[PDB]
């Protein structure tokens, strides 16, 4: 159930260029004979994608990242690749996503799985039911914390006569999948051309994903030795992995409503021109498309090299306070203060700021700060605000309408109350 598989045939990873591949309908809207520009996570044109082989005993199935998305394409003839795995650590300590394809059905689970190294689906014969079953317990050992399950029709269906391209995304709470099946006769690498991927599902798993791995099948027909890193043979099935990025595309639509072409606006200045003119044809001439701007490299922070703390302690933790009609004023100057600690302190029942927020207050310099302090009762606290009326705001302490500062108050019944 957890056998290892450590055949040792080392070959370097290959790279290929994705000429025009990975385009998918961003929304479920119909468009015809129109050019539409949209920004979304796409596979840039002529992108540097890795290449992995499974030909004989060379197997390539490492754990790869899932930074923002994946364009997964597979040239197959025997459906050797059965599914994928998604997660952060791929062990029982965290939740993980699983996608596998049984004959004429799909199994999707979000459990805390404990995958063994070099997993895979096993195929054998059962001698009852008279049919070669496909038990999946080689992939994962245990399944804890299951929350989601789902079954549907095959995602993958029938040298390489067919091409299956997939697009995976991990948007806020939805795992979105776009797929396409294209027949081709090319056997070496990706066929240059164009083909759009139609969406398939959008699973609301709502988890965090950073790594992913692929699942393949093995052939042990001609003979079967004991379970070990041997006795397995993999037919010719290779796959390419590409990471998506936020990109602005200009999409074309035909009469039918299919895409059939597109343009990556940041590929080259000619693409910038095409996107600017909202056309795939550019007439002879000069066009203004963008603006060159040199960006800063680093920040420069300069302040006087002085060292002193503002005496907020003798203002807030003062032994006695003043009456509101004779409210005391303290002028704070020539010092450095941390308003973050003041805001952090939960001794205050009222902490309202105007024209500036306290979180963005410990990085702004002022020439002078005035600290007015007094004592009022509960229902009068609301009168200490710009544009308020009452006995206190009219006759005792009035705030301007352009006030820039914070109003802080706290219940002092334990200190400012007498039994009599």
């Amino acid at each position, epitope marked *: 159930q957890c056998v290892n598989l450590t055949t040792r045939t080392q070959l370097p990873p290959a790279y290929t260029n994705s000429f025009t591949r990975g385009v998918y309908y961003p929304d479920k809207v119909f468009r015809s004979s129109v050019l539409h520009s949209t920004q979304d996570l796409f596979l840039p044109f002529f992108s540097n994608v890795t290449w992995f082989h499974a030909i004989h005993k060379r197997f390539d199935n490492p754990v790869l990242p899932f930074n923002d998305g994946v364009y997964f394409a597979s040239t197959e003839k025997s459906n050797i690749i059965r599914g994928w795995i998604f997660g952060t650590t791929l062990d029982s300590k965290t939740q993980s996503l699983l996608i596998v394809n049984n004959a004429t059905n799909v199994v999707i689970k979000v459990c805390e799985f404990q995958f063994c190294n070099d997993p895979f689906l096993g195929v054998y014969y*059962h001698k*009852n039911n008279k049919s070669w079953m496909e*038990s999946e*317990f080689r992939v994962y050992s245990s399944a804890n914390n299951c929350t989601f399950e789902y079954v549907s029709q095959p995602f993958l269906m029938d040298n390489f006569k067919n091409l299956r391209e997939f697009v995976f995304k991990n948007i806020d709470g939805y795992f979105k999948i776009y797929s396409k099946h294209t027949p081709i006769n090319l056997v070496r690498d990706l066929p240059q051309g164009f083909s759009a991927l139609e969406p398939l599902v959008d699973l609301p798993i709502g988890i965090n994903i950073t790594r992913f791995q692929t699942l393949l099948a093995l052939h042990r027909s001609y003979l079967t030795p*004991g*379970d070990s890193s041997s006795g397995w043979t993999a037919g010719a099935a290779a796959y390419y992995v590409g990471y998506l990025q936020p990109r602005t595309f200009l999409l074309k639509y035909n009469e039918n409503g299919t895409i059939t072409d597109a343009v990556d606006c940041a590929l080259d200045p000619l693409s910038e021109t095409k996107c600017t003119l909202k056309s795939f044809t550019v007439e002879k001439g000069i066009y203004q498309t963008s603006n060159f701007r040199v960006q800063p490299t680093e920040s420069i922070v300069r302040f006087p090299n002085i060292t002193n703390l503002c005496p907020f302690g003798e203002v807030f933790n003062a032994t006695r306070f003043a009456s509101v009609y004779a409210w005391n004023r303290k002028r704070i100057s020539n010092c450095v203060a941390d308003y973050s600690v003041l805001y952090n302190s939960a001794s205050f029942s009222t902490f309202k700021c105007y024209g500036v927020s306290p979180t963005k207050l410990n990085d702004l310099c002022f020439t002078n700060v005035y600290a007015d302090s007094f004592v009022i009762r509960g229902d009068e606290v609301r009168q200490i605000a710009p544009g308020q009326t009452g006995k206190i705001a009219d006759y005792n302490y009035k705030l301007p309408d352009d006030f820039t500062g914070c109003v802080i108050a706290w219940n002092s019944n334990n200190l400012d109350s007498k039994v009599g």
Partner: antibody
Amino acid sequence: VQLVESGGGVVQPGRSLRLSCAASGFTFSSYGMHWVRQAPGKGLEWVALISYDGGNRYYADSVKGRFTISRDNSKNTLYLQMNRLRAEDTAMYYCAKDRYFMDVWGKGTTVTVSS
Amino acid sequence: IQLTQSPGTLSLSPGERATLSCRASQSISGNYLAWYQHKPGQAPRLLIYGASTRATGIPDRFSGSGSGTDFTLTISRLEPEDFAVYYCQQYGSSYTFGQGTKVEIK
């Protein structure tokens, strides 16, 4: 990962006794299951094995024709039917899961063949 | 396949080195040779498989060697918990066990 045997006790020579092994905590239907016995103060003696799917069975030479091993994958149970018992079959019989070798062993059921 | 273990009884003290042997009447296929530990009143516990592969949780003072008909289990620095009966087993052609070696305190 737990195996609990049952059905032990005293049985008169020549009569029959059926042992059972209840499994939980693992994918029972994907493992071959063995029976092993150990006479008091003596060594381990393999008795029988049944494949994960119940298609293949094998028995020790000393019990061929007399013992039958079976399993029920829907109920996570393995059974050992012991017919025509001899005084020399008295032992503790262990239920054990195949990993091949056996990596999970039950506590064993004591079978005494006596009048 | 008959497995003959030797010696019948081994008497040592903690800290010493123990060597246990297992001989098969026929060559073991695929190095399918396993070692088991048994304490009184306890079920057996897997120590070694594949002639040389340590089982999960087994400390590195246990090591297995040998091939063909001749196999050895070595315990490099005996601990008090290591005093027990040891059985070898072949699983390449049916399933047969040795008669056991008792490792006792001298």
